[PDB]
Amino acid sequence: RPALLRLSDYLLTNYRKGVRPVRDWRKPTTVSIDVIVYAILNVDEKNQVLTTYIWYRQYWTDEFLQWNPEDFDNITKLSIPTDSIWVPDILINEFVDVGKSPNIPYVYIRHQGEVQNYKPLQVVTACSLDIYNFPFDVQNCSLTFTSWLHTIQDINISLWRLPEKVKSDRSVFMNQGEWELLGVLPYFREFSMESSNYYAEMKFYVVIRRR
Amino acid sequence: RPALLRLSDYLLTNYRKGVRPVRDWRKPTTVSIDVIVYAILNVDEKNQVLTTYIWYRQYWTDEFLQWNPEDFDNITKLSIPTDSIWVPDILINEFVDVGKSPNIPYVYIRHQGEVQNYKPLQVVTACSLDIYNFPFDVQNCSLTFTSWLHTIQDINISLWRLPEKVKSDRSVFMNQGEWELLGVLPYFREFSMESSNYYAEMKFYVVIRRR
Amino acid sequence: RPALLRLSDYLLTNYRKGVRPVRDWRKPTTVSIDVIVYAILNVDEKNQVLTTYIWYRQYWTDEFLQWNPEDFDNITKLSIPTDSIWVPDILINEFVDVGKSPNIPYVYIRHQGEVQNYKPLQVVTACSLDIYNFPFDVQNCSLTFTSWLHTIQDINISLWRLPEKVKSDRSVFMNQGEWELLGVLPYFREFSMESSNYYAEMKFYVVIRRR
Amino acid sequence: RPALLRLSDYLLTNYRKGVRPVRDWRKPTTVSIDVIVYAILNVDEKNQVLTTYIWYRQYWTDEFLQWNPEDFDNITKLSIPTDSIWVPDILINEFVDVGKSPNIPYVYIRHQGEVQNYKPLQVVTACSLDIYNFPFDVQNCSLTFTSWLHTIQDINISLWRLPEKVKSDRSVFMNQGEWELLGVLPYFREFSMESSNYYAEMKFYVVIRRR
Amino acid sequence: RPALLRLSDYLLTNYRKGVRPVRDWRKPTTVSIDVIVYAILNVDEKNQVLTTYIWYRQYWTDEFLQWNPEDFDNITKLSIPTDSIWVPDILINEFVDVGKSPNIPYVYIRHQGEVQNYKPLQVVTACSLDIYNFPFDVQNCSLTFTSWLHTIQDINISLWRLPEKVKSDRSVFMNQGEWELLGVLPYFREFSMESSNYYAEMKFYVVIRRR
Numbered sequence A, B, C, D, E: 001r002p003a004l005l006r007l008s009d010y011l012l013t014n015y016r017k018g019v020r021p022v023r024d025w026r027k028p029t030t031v032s033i034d035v036i037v038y039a040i041l042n043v044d045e046k047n048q049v050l051t052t053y054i055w056y057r058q059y060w061t062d063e064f065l066q067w068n069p070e071d072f073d074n075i076t077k078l079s080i081p082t083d084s085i086w087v088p089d090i091l092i093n094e095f096v097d098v099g100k101s102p103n104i105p106y107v108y109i110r111h112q113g114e115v116q117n118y119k120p121l122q123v124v125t126a127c128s129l130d131i132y133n134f135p136f137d138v139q140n141c142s143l144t145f146t147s148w149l150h151t152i153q154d155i156n157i158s159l160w161r162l163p164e165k166v167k168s169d170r171s172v173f174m175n176q177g178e179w180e181l182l183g184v185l186p187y188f189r190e191f192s193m194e195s196s197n198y199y200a201e202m203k204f205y206v207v208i209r210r211r
C-alpha cells in the first residue's frame, strides 16, 4: 500500500464529521482567518451594496486528524476533501448574496492536526454608502466574520497575520478599477444579545476612495 | 474515546430523521420561533414586493435526542449537523424567492432534548404596497410562518420571547437605509380551509415608514 | 420502541422508491390534483409570460405503504420525507422557469396507503397575451399538468375537488394586485401524438381581467 | 413479491451505472434522438442569442437491462429512475445557459433492453442573427447535439423519425408568438480535430421568419 | 462477466477518490491543459468584465487507475464517471461567475493510467477594458489557470499542445460576432506570496479587436 492511501485510511476510517474535533469538549476551537481583497467588482449606491472578490484563508486544529510522520513515509502534509472533515460555520454577516462562490474540494492538513482551508469569496454585502462627496467620494464598508451558531466557548476567531501587515495588503489587488483600496482594518469584538451567549466576530473595514 | 464522540455515537447510532421526534404520537411538537429584522434591502412598489434580511431562530424538543450529562463528561450541550436530525417544515408563506438564504450546517442541542436552530433568511415577500403618501409613505407588510404540511395536532408554533420585547426590537437593525422600522407585531391564528384540518401560523407585521 | 419509529421501520425497511407502487402492474396509478391561485406576481406582455404563485396539492395510493393501525398504537397517519417514496412525475407544461419553487421535505401518509403531497409552485408559464383591450384587458392563460413520461396506462390525473368548487375558488387569493382572478376552469383531455401512446393531462385556465 | 419489485431487483441488483452498457466493448452505443420545437421564447439580436423551448426525446439499448417477460408476469416495459442507469452525455453545443431545464426523474425501459428518455430543454444558444431585413427578417439558427466526450466508436447519434417528418413538424408549436417556425432541418456530420478522434453530431437548423 | 464490467470492478473496488493518485507522495502530479476559445459572448466595458465560452480539456496520470489490456479483452481505454475518481482543483482565477458551466459526467481513461477530461467553461472574468480607441478598440484580457490549493510540489500545470499551435487556434471560433480573436498567448509563471509556498499557474492572454 502506498503511504498516502495508508495515511488516508488510518485517518478517515475512525473519524466522523459531525462532532467538533477536540479531545476535551471544555476547550474552544480557535480559528485563525485572513482576508485579501482581490478586486472590487461593483459599488452600488442605489441599492447600498458593494461586491468584493476577496481571497479567504483560514486554519484550525483537528485533534483527531494527527499522526506521527515516521510511520507514514515521513508524510508531513496531505490533502483530502473538505466535505470529509469538520469545517467551522464561520460566515460573514451583512451579506446579501454568496452563491457566486464555488465550493473548493480539498483542504491541506499537517501532521500536527492543523487544517488549512483556502477558498474564494464572491460575497456582496449591504452597507451604508453615501454619495455626498461624489467626485472625490471615500467609502467605508465592513466585513464581519463570525461563527454563525457556535459561541465563543466553542469557536473563537483570530488573525492569521499581524494586523498591520493585513491592514496594508495591496499585493494582489486588481488596481485598475474605478475604486482604490486604502486599507483593510481588522477588529475583534465579542458580540452578545442574550444574557448568557457570547459570540466572537472579526470586523474587516474595507476603505476605498473613488478615482 | 473522547466524550463528544461517545455522545454523538450514543445519540445518532439509534436515531433516524424521517419520523417526528416524539415518544407518543398523540402529542404535538411545539416549535418556538423568533424574528429579528437585520435590514430592509429593497421595497419595490412596481412589483409589490419587498426584501427583508431577517435573523431567524427557533427551537423544539427532540424526545429521542436526550441524555444524562454525568455519563458523558458532564456535556450539557453539543452541536451536530442539521441534516442529521428531524427539522420542522416551518416555511414562510407570501414568499417569492428564498434561494438567497444559505443552509446553515449545524444546530445546537441540549441534554434535555431541546434543539436550537439559528439561520438567516433572505426572503422576498409579496405584499400590498401603496404609494399614496409617497413623500411620507408608511407601509405595512406581513410575514407569516407556518408548518407547511403538518397540522396543529403535529406541529404548533409559539414565540421564543414575549410579544412586546420582539415588537420593539431594533437592536441589530441596519438603521441607515431609506426605510425605518417602527415595529414587528406578532400574531397567532389557526388557519383552516378543509372541514377537519387546522394549521398553526404566526404572522409578523413589519411596519416601516419612509425617510 | 415508540409507535412512530416501529411504523417507519415496518414501512421503509422493505420498500424501494424506484418502482411504481402497485401490487399489479396492469393497473394505473390514479393521481388526484388540485390547484389554488395564491397570487399573480407578474403578467409580461412583452415576453408573453406571466408568473403565478399557486398552492398545489395532490394525492395518490401507494399499495405498499399501508398498515393496520391497531398494530401500531392506532396510528392513522404519519409524515415521512418525500424523497423516501415514489412520487409521480406530474409536471406542468408551457413552463419557462420553475426553479423558484422550494422542495417540500415531508408528505402525509394514511393507513389506507393514500399519500398526500402539498407543495408550492412559483412557475412562470408562456402563453399568448394580447394587449388589444389594454385599458380593460382580459387575459386567458392556461396551466396543463401531465405525467411527463408515464402514459395513461401507468399514471392518470383526476380532480381532488368538484370542478365547480375549484372554478370559483378565490379563498386565499391576494386580491390587491393589478389583476383580478375571475375563475380557474379545469379540463381533462387525452393527449396523443404517436400511434400507440396516450397521456393524460389536466388543463387549468386562469381567467384574469385588469383593473 | 409483486412482479414490478421482482423485476426491479433482478435488474438493478447486478448492475452499475459507471460502465457503458454493452456486452462487447468493441461495438458502439447507437443513440437515436428527436427534436420538437414547442416554443421560441426570445430572439435577442443584441446579444446574438435566442431561446428555444424544445421537447427532446432519445432512446438507446442497454444490453444489461433486458429480461424475458414471461418470468415477470409478462411485464413488457417499466419505469425506473434516470439516475439509476447509464445515460449518454449527449449535449448540445453552442449553448449559453441550460440550467432552466428540470431533471426528469424517470425513464421508460422495455424488455428488449431499449431505454427511452423524454426530457424538456430550455436551452439558450449563441448563433449569428442579422437584422438586415428587420421588417421581414428570416433567421437561421442551429442546434447541434453531440456526445460531448465519447467518440463515434463509443457513441453514435441517429434520428428517431425520418428526416422529412421532423423537418415539417409544427404539431405542438406555440404558433402565436412573434416568430413562425418554417422547418427544423437535421444534418449528420462526423466532427474531428485531432488526427485520430472522430465524434458524431447531429445539427438541427431551426428556420424562423418574423411576423 | 463482460470485459468492461470486470475492468470497472477491478479498478474502482480498490480505489478511493480522496487521495492524490501517486504511488510515491514525493512526486508531483503533472497536469497538461489546453484552451480553445469557442465564442466571446459579451465584453462589458461598464462592469469591466467579459464572457468567454471556451472548450477546456486537460489530462493527468492516475498511478492507481492502470491495467494490462490483455487481461481485460484488450481494452485500451474506457469511460467512467468523473465523480468516481480524483480530479485536480485546477481553477481559473480572475473569475466572477462560473455557475453557467454544466458538470460533465464522464472522463476517458487509458490503460497507462492517463485520465482525459473534456469540459466546457462559461466563465466570466474581471479584467481591465479601456475604451480609449472605441471605434478601433483592441483589448487584452487574461485567463490564468492554477491549482487553487495544491502547491507546485503537489500539482504542476503544463501545455497539452505546443505554444505556437494554441496561440493561433481559431479552428472552432464563432467568427461572426462583434469581436475577432487575434490570438491566445500562453504563459507559465510560479506564483508565490508566502516564504515557502510556490504555486504553478498558466496565463492565457485572449487578444481581441473590435470590428
Ligand SMILES: *[C@@H]1O[C@H](CO)[C@@H](O[C@@H]2O[C@H](CO)[C@@H](O)[C@H](O)[C@H]2NC(C)=O)[C@H](O)[C@H]1NC(C)=O
Residues within 6 Å of the ligand: A028, A152, A153, A156, A157, A158, A159, A188, A200
Ligand atoms: C478569542 O480570541 C481573541 C483573539 O485572539 C482573544 O483576544 C485576545 O486575547 C489575548 C489574550 O487574552 C489578548 O492579549 C489580546 O489583547 C486579545 N485581543 C486581541 C485582538 O488579540 C480572546 O481572548 C479569545 N477568547 C477566548 C475565550 O478564547
Ligand SMILES: *[C@@H]1O[C@H](CO)[C@@H](O[C@@H]2O[C@H](CO)[C@@H](O)[C@H](O)[C@H]2NC(C)=O)[C@H](O)[C@H]1NC(C)=O
Residues within 6 Å of the ligand: A138, A140, A185, A186, A187, A205, A207
Ligand atoms: C473606517 O471606519 C473605521 C471604523 O470606524 C475607522 O477605523 C477607526 O478609525 C478611528 C479614527 O479615529 C480610530 O481611532 C480607530 O482606532 C479605528 N479603528 C480600527 C479598528 O482601525 C477608519 O478610520 C474609517 N476610515 C475612514 C477613511 O473613515
Ligand SMILES: *[C@@H]1O[C@H](CO)[C@@H](O[C@@H]2O[C@H](CO)[C@@H](O)[C@H](O)[C@H]2NC(C)=O)[C@H](O)[C@H]1NC(C)=O
Residues within 6 Å of the ligand: B028, B152, B153, B156, B157, B158, B159, B188, B200
Ligand atoms: C398552540 O400554541 C399557541 C401559542 O402558544 C397556543 O395559544 C395559546 O394557548 C394558551 C393556552 O391555551 C393561551 O393562554 C393563549 O392565550 C393562547 N394564545 C397565545 C397567543 O398564546 C395554542 O393553545 C396551542 N395549541 C395547541 C393545540 O397546542
Ligand SMILES: *[C@@H]1O[C@H](CO)[C@@H](O[C@@H]2O[C@H](CO)[C@@H](O)[C@H](O)[C@H]2NC(C)=O)[C@H](O)[C@H]1NC(C)=O
Residues within 6 Å of the ligand: B138, B140, B185, B186, B187, B205, B207
Ligand atoms: C399594520 O397592520 C397590523 C395588522 O392589521 C396592525 O396591528 C393592529 O392594529 C390595530 C389598530 O387598531 C390593533 O387594534 C390590533 O390589535 C393590531 N394587531 C396586532 C396583531 O398588533 C398595525 O397597527 C398596522 N400598522 C400601521 C402603521 O398601520
Ligand SMILES: *[C@@H]1O[C@H](CO)[C@@H](O[C@@H]2O[C@H](CO)[C@@H](O)[C@H](O)[C@H]2NC(C)=O)[C@H](O)[C@H]1NC(C)=O
Residues within 6 Å of the ligand: C028, C152, C153, C156, C157, C158, C159, C188, C200
Ligand atoms: C382517467 O381519469 C379521468 C378523470 O377521472 C377519467 O375520465 C372520466 O371517466 C369517468 C368514468 O369513465 C367518466 O364518467 C367521466 O366523464 C370522465 N371524465 C371526467 C372529466 O371525469 C378517465 O376515464 C380515466 N382513464 C383511465 C384509463 O383511468
Ligand SMILES: *[C@@H]1O[C@H](CO)[C@@H](O[C@@H]2O[C@H](CO)[C@@H](O)[C@H](O)[C@H]2NC(C)=O)[C@H](O)[C@H]1NC(C)=O
Residues within 6 Å of the ligand: C138, C140, C185, C186, C187, C205, C207
Ligand atoms: C378562456 O378559455 C377557456 C377555454 O377556451 C374558455 O372556457 C370555455 O368557454 C366556452 C365558451 O363558449 C365554453 O363553451 C367551454 O365549455 C369552456 N371550457 C371550459 C373547459 O370551461 C373560457 O370561457 C375562456 N374565458 C374567457 C374570459 O374568454
Ligand SMILES: *[C@@H]1O[C@H](CO)[C@@H](O[C@@H]2O[C@H](CO)[C@@H](O)[C@H](O)[C@H]2NC(C)=O)[C@H](O)[C@H]1NC(C)=O
Residues within 6 Å of the ligand: D028, D152, D153, D156, D157, D158, D159, D188, D200
Ligand atoms: C453513425 O450513425 C449514422 C446515422 O445513423 C450513420 O450514417 C449513415 O450510415 C448508413 C449506413 O452506413 C448510411 O446508409 C447513411 O447514408 C448514413 N447517413 C445517414 C444520415 O443516415 C453512420 O454510418 C454511423 N456510424 C457508425 C460508426 O456507427
Ligand SMILES: *[C@@H]1O[C@H](CO)[C@@H](O[C@@H]2O[C@H](CO)[C@@H](O)[C@H](O)[C@H]2NC(C)=O)[C@H](O)[C@H]1NC(C)=O
Residues within 6 Å of the ligand: D138, D140, D185, D186, D187, D205, D207
Ligand atoms: C438554413 O441553413 C441550412 C444549412 O445551411 C439550409 O439548409 C441547406 O440549404 C441548401 C440550399 O441550397 C441545401 O442545398 C442543403 O441541402 C440544405 N441542407 C440541409 C441539411 O437541409 C437552409 O436552406 C437555410 N434556410 C434558410 C431559410 O436560409
Ligand SMILES: *[C@@H]1O[C@H](CO)[C@@H](O[C@@H]2O[C@H](CO)[C@@H](O)[C@H](O)[C@H]2NC(C)=O)[C@H](O)[C@H]1NC(C)=O
Residues within 6 Å of the ligand: E028, E152, E153, E156, E157, E158, E159, E188, E200
Ligand atoms: C512545472 O511544469 C513547467 C512546465 O512544464 C516546467 O517548466 C519547464 O521546465 C522545463 C524543464 O525544466 C524547461 O525546459 C522549460 O523551459 C520550463 N518552462 C516551460 C514553459 O516549459 C517546470 O519545470 C515544472 N516544475 C516542476 C516542479 O515540476
Ligand SMILES: *[C@@H]1O[C@H](CO)[C@@H](O[C@@H]2O[C@H](CO)[C@@H](O)[C@H](O)[C@H]2NC(C)=O)[C@H](O)[C@H]1NC(C)=O
Residues within 6 Å of the ligand: E138, E140, E185, E186, E187, E205, E207
Ligand atoms: C497582450 O498582453 C500580452 C502580455 O503582456 C502580450 O504578450 C507579450 O507581448 C510582448 C510584446 O513586446 C512580448 O515581448 C512578450 O513576449 C509577450 N508575452 C507572451 C507571453 O506572449 C501581448 O503582446 C499583448 N497583446 C496586445 C495586442 O497588446
Ligand SMILES: Cc1ccc(Sc2ccccc2N2CCNCC2)c(C)c1
Residues within 6 Å of the ligand: A146, A147, A148, A149, A193, A194, A199, B036, B055, B056, B057, B118, B119, B120, B171, B172
Ligand atoms: C434577542 C436576541 C438574541 C440573539 C440574537 S443573535 C441571532 C438571532 C437569530 C439568528 C441568529 C443570530 N446570530 C447568533 C450569533 N451569530 C450571528 C447570528 C439577537 C439578534 C437577538
Ligand SMILES: Cc1ccc(Sc2ccccc2N2CCNCC2)c(C)c1
Residues within 6 Å of the ligand: B146, B147, B148, B149, B193, B194, B199, C036, C055, C056, C057, C118, C119, C120, C171, C172
Ligand atoms: C380547499 C382548500 C383546502 C386546503 C387549502 S391549504 C393548501 C392547499 C394546497 C397546498 C398547500 C396548502 N397549505 C396547507 C397548510 N400550510 C399552508 C399551505 C386551501 C388553500 C384550500
Ligand SMILES: Cc1ccc(Sc2ccccc2N2CCNCC2)c(C)c1
Residues within 6 Å of the ligand: C146, C147, C148, C149, C193, C194, C199, D036, D055, D056, D057, D118, D119, D120, D171, D172
Ligand atoms: C411525434 C411526437 C411523438 C411524441 C410527442 S410527445 C413528447 C416528445 C418529446 C419529449 C416529451 C414528450 N412528451 C410526452 C408526454 N408528456 C408530455 C411530453 C410529440 C410532441 C411528437
Ligand SMILES: Cc1ccc(Sc2ccccc2N2CCNCC2)c(C)c1
Residues within 6 Å of the ligand: D146, D147, D148, D149, D193, D194, D199, E036, E055, E056, E057, E118, E119, E120, E171, E172
Ligand atoms: C486541437 C483540438 C482538439 C480537440 C478539439 S474538440 C474539444 C476540445 C476541448 C474540449 C472539448 C472538445 N470536444 C470534444 C468532442 N465533443 C465536443 C467538444 C478541438 C476543438 C481542438
Ligand SMILES: Cc1ccc(Sc2ccccc2N2CCNCC2)c(C)c1
Residues within 6 Å of the ligand: A036, A055, A056, A057, A118, A119, A120, A171, A172, E146, E147, E148, E149, E193, E194, E199
Ligand atoms: C500573504 C499571502 C499569502 C498567500 C496568498 S495566496 C491565497 C490566499 C488566500 C486564499 C487563496 C490563495 N491562493 C493560493 C494559491 N492558489 C490561488 C489562491 C496571498 C494572496 C497572500
Ligand SMILES: *[C@@H]1O[C@H](CO)[C@@H](O)[C@H](O)[C@H]1NC(C)=O
Residues within 6 Å of the ligand: A070, A073, A074
Ligand atoms: C524519515 O526521516 C528520518 C529523519 O530525517 C530519517 O531517518 C528516515 O530515514 C526517513 N524515512 C524515510 C522513509 O524517508
